[PDB]
């Protein structure tokens, strides 16, 4: 439990494969960046596109596009029936 300056130059440490193998550390590090950068671009754009109500990033939701396509289909059919009824009833109304 003491300490004083020893002043000895020669070294028998045999010390310096951590040089080009610490490379690996900074390749793993860049390898992490690729998924992260791709995700940032994707999530940013999907926030942009989402503000556009018709621009189809909404088609990625299958059930609801389904549901809309079924919704519109029912309406068109009904509306055409109502038309043909309104059509016949009008020429009834006109014939003396």
């Amino acid at each position: 439990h003491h300490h004083h300056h020893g002043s000895d130059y020669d070294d028998i440490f045999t010390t310096e494969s951590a040089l080009k193998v610490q490379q690996k550390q900074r390749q793993k590090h860049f390898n992490r960046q690729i998924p992260a950068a791709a995700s940032l671009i994707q999530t940013a754009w999907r926030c942009y596109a989402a503000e556009n109500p018709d621009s189809s990033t909404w088609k990625i939701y299958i059930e609801f596009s389904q549901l809309r396509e079924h919704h519109r289909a029912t309406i068109k059919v009904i509306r055409r029936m109502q038309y043909f009824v309104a059509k016949k009833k009008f020429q009834q109304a006109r014939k003396p």
């Binding site: 079924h70 289909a73 029912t74 309406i75 068109k76 059919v77 009904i78 055409r80 029936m81 109502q82 038309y83 043909f84 009824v85 309104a86 059509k87 016949k88 009833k89 009008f90 020429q91 006109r94």
Partner: protein
């Protein structure tokens, strides 16, 4: 055509939850009630009687196809529409008042929402000062 036959087959199934290949009034009434509408047995009878051609009271798939394939954009029926417009036109020529249109569209028949007749009126883009020429409209509906 390929596209649309498949489309019609799917639309038919939307009204026929039964899978039996028939569409009854209660089937049709259910679809319209699900869409927030309140139709009556008479109106449903009328709707079906205009589609059902064999008089059995219900609609099959061939009968359904015939109505979907039925003409609408035709030489005869845009003249049927034009004279409906002529009913409301007193003067005799071809304009109906812009204010008058909103009145009859929103307060008569099936009625109509103000946002819907806004769409009509901006689909218009005609005004002497406030006047819509109706034959242009019928030819818009008929292209």
């Amino acid at each position: 055509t390929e596209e649309q036959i498949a489309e019609f087959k799917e639309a038919f199934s939307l009204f026929d939850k039964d899978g039996d290949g028939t569409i009854t009034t209660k089937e049709l009434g259910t679809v319209m009630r699900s869409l927030g509408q309140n139709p009556t047995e008479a109106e449903l009878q009328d709707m079906i009687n205009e589609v059902d051609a064999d008089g059995n009271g219900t609609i099959d798939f061939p009968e359904f196809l015939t109505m979907m394939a039925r003409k609408m954009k035709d030489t005869d029926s845009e003249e049927e529409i034009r004279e409906a417009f002529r009913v409301f036109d007193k003067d005799g020529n071809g304009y109906i008042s812009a204010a008058e249109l909103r009145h009859v569209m929103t307060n008569l028949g099936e009625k109509l929402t103000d946002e819907e007749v806004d769409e009509m009126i901006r689909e218009a883009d005609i005004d002497g000062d406030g006047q819509v020429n109706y034959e242009e409209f019928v030819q818009m509906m008929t292209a």
